[PDB]
Amino acid sequence: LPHPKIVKKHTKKFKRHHSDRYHRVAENWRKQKGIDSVVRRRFRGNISQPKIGYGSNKKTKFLSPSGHKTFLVANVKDLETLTMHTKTYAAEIAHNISAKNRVVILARAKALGIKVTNPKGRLAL
Amino acid sequence: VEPVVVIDGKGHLVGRLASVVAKQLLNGQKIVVVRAEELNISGEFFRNKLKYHDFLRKATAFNKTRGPFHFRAPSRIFYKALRGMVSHKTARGKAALERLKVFEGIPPPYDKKKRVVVPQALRVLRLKPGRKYTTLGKLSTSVGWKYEDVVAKLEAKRKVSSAEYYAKKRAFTKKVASANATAAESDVAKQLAALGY
């Protein structure tokens, strides 16, 4: 699909303050609640915080580098909902699907022209 | 514009020279200051002799042996005046100073090689006529440096060995000046002149 040049604004992950120093403090983002915190008062040098400005362009949101929107698929029935949106959406074969069923899904998605984001998953030659 | 740029302190001003030599390093420009001893400062002698000793009384308390090491040798006296403008800590510096080489006098293998001067740091081009102005030499002497003599003598020798040279050379370019002077006028010549040469 002819897509716009996808701008990301912030590629780096918004890690927590002192997530790296201490081990018990997780890298998952939590706001600094204390009034005397430098991160909360956004001092120069300190880590950047997640705010609404970093939000992605509506036209190019949810899009993978291929220019397709991601879409989970369990079986051949859920796969065949994207018979009309091959250029827009991409089949993401779910993690828990067996190797026995994937060979079936990949056969159909290849025929319908649906780009699968994760082929070669559990499947040798 | 020249891998190395041997400079000649003789008739300069610690600070200005320095400075300009500084910049030249931080911008990848190898350098080599010579005749260090015959450098120059500003203001009477008794001056620089103070505005130094003070720098001498320095020293650390508990352990004087771990404080401001007061180098006498000019080369150094000046090398400091320089390492003073060069972060001389962050690698970017170390990288510099690492590009320097201040000698007292003019030892090989430079002796035999051209030098220059930083026209923006000459006693004779910055100091208002007749006005007190040190000469490192004495200054160093007065505060330690035990060689002003050696270089001194061991100097004059260098000037000889050369002076003698020049002659041979000067006596050489005396010919050329003629060779062309004669071979001049002809044709092939005329032409050039026209275009400029």
Binding site: - | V1, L25, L26, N27, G28, Q29, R92, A95
Partner: protein, 106 residues
Amino acid sequence: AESHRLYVKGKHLSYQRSKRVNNPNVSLIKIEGVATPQDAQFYLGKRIAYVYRASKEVRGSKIRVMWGKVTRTHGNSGVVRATFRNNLPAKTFGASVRIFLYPSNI
């Protein structure tokens, strides 16, 4: 025979900076024999290359190149602002940078 040089050689000085903040995107380039902004106006828009040896051989050559452009002048000395694709490494503060003669106004 000796000279194959189709570039004016100039040193990479620093990044565009204040006292306490530096923008690594815009590099400052001294060019040889350039004294004024008026002389530097000629070099605006010309392609720059920083050429350097690397350890590993990439494409039958141990030598890699970063390409960029002169954007504008910087002060009265003929120091020039310059934006590359990938920014210059900051280890190169005082390293030779090849400024070419394309694209030509003349």
